[PDB]
Design a protein around this ligand. Structure first.
Ligand SMILES: O=C(Nc1cccc(C(=O)O)c1)Nc1ccc(Cl)c(Cl)c1
Ligand SMILES: O=C(Nc1cccc(C(=O)O)c1)Nc1ccc(Cl)c(Cl)c1
Ligand SMILES: *Cc1c(COP(=O)(O)O)cnc(C)c1O
Ligand SMILES: *Cc1c(COP(=O)(O)O)cnc(C)c1O
Lengths: 292, 281
């Protein structure tokens, strides 16, 4: 049991995808190629961002960067903002988010429900514009505390100390780890941990079809897949149809990459155990029509 | 690790509500009065109905009542239908849900995404259709003892294991499975434990002996409490949780006024996602 929602975080289930996996059982045709889904919607606000959000705040608190009642400022496409907003309610901080104006209405509603102030940056330039806008706001008011999810090592550390160790415990036979590439925390932290323990482990990024996050270490990745929106939608729908998991759009892209890695292993007669991140659920994407 | 999403069900967390509790810590004014929230949104389709749904299906399979490719029929306001739809997808059954009109659109969207067929306007309608089509399987959540069993065998034990000092259990009263199953378990194991319903202001599962209290809760109070929970504890709960929290706070204020220790467990049956379209948030 836990003393607050903040602690009911991580230790997420890993579920074998027996129908979607290229080959679930070993046999006469060759070795198994299995997919394993780590369900990061089993978290306080329903996404993986709860891990770095909470660790970024707590580390900021430890470093004396946050006095009680402080106002936090963060550029976000939504998930990090929501996680931070939750954490800010339990810890007594105010929150200002800079979010692109072309984000789903669900994200907006949930941030307002948590009492975050939202500044909607121009759609054009997307997250680059959000980040640049937040830097301009940080400079107009230095009392505001920007944790900076694209450069804060506590982001990466949450996956190094959490996501990675959880994966190795549940899946010591892991051959591949597949996840989306955004802040880069998930892949950098989980990947660094897994490469220290698992000999020839492959770390595979899925990214949408500039601005390089400061967290990014190019030596960590084996490969990067670019996935178009149509394939991401297709795989998201396919995951709920075949395995019952109602995931967000990034999971479709990750799945697309993982099935590619999977098809490659199968065609080469190689055993594979491919862990893939389900970073959030489908709820915040319903208004997009992608599940229609 | 798990083999299927169906297995990643239950063993939900219990979270202390330090801010909303009448008194978290023992002090000179008297003993603690604690609220503990069991997060049943941490489940395959995001609600407590995953427990009875999966158990009803698996019990119908073992009993031989349910054969490959069968059509399943169920009257539902959404949560049960969603749970069944997910499980029917995995197990290869067709699902028809009989629902009221004015169900939130998020419900219909997720039902259709899982491939469920929706028929509007619910129990009587389902019963007629089932009678007309004897090969359809109507599990019937209002009277199937696998619903209650799912809580007697899951929710109850998990709660006792995490909260052996429990004095009260509070939940919504719908099919009555949660309170009958959890409540019977708790009353058979914990001396003088109290079992408290919240209902909005008769299923064959209901047993009049189990409940020690029941509170009717108005919509405005339910909404207020739901909003209060998210503002104060960070938990984004559905509306039933508001009503449940209303009852739990009432019971907690009683214990505080009486100077008695209380450890009150309450069910968060689902999250807020499906209720955004209602404006309540
Ligand atoms: O990278 C993200 N999300 C993201 C990145 C950085 C910050 C945030 C945030 O919630 O603030 C979200 N999603 C993602 C990542 C990769 C792919 Cl392929 C797709 Cl489709 C989506
Ligand atoms: O009882 C329900 N929901 C319910 C009952 C029966 C069936 C279903 C279903 O998902 O089909 C849902 N919710 C509930 C229960 C108690 C209160 Cl006070 C409030 Cl506000 C809501
Ligand atoms: C953040 C996020 C990602 C990418 O994770 P990073 O650790 O930021 O690279 C993928 N999908 C979703 C839904 C996210 O919120
Ligand atoms: C079913 C349900 C309840 C009531 O539980 P029963 O076991 O049916 O009495 C309460 N809240 C929500 C959100 C539900 O789906």
């Amino acid at each position: 049991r836990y003393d607050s929602l903040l602690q009911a975080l991580g230790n997420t289930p890993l579920v074998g995808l027996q129908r979607l996996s290229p080959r679930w059982d070993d046999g006469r045709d060759g070795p198994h190629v299995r997919l394993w889904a780590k369900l990061e919607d089993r978290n306080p606000t329903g996404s993986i961002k709860d891990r770095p959000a909470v660790r970024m705040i707590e580390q900021a608190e430890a470093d004396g960067l946050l006095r009680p009642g402080a106002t936090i400022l963060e550029p976000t496409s939504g998930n990090t903002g929501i996680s931070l907003a939750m954490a800010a309610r339990l810890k007594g901080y105010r929150l200002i988010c800079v979010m692109p104006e072309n984000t789903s209405v669900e994200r907006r509603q949930l941030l307002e429900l948590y009492g975050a102030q939202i500044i909607f940056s121009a759609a054009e330039g997307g997250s680059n514009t959000a980040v640049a806008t937040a830097k301009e706001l940080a400079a107009t008011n230095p009392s505001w505390v920007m944790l900076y999810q694209y450069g804060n090592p506590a982001n990466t550390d949450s996956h190094y100390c959490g996501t990675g160790p959880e994966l190795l415990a549940d899946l010591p036979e892991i051959t591949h780890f597949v996840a989306g590439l955004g802040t880069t925390g998930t892949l950098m932290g989980t990947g660094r941990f897994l490469r220290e323990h698992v000999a020839n482990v492959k770390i595979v990024a899925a990214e949408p079809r500039g601005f390089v996050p400061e967290l990014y270490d190019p030596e960590i990745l084996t490969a990067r897949y670019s996935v178009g929106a149509v394939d991401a939608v297709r795989r998201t729908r396919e995951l709920v149809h075949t395995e019952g998991i109602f995931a967000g759009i990034s999971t479709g892209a990750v799945l697309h990459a993982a099935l590619g890695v999977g098809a490659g292993a199968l065609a080469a007669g190689e055993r594979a155990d491919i862990a893939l991140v389900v970073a959030d659920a489908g709820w915040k994407y319903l208004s997009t029509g992608a599940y229609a």
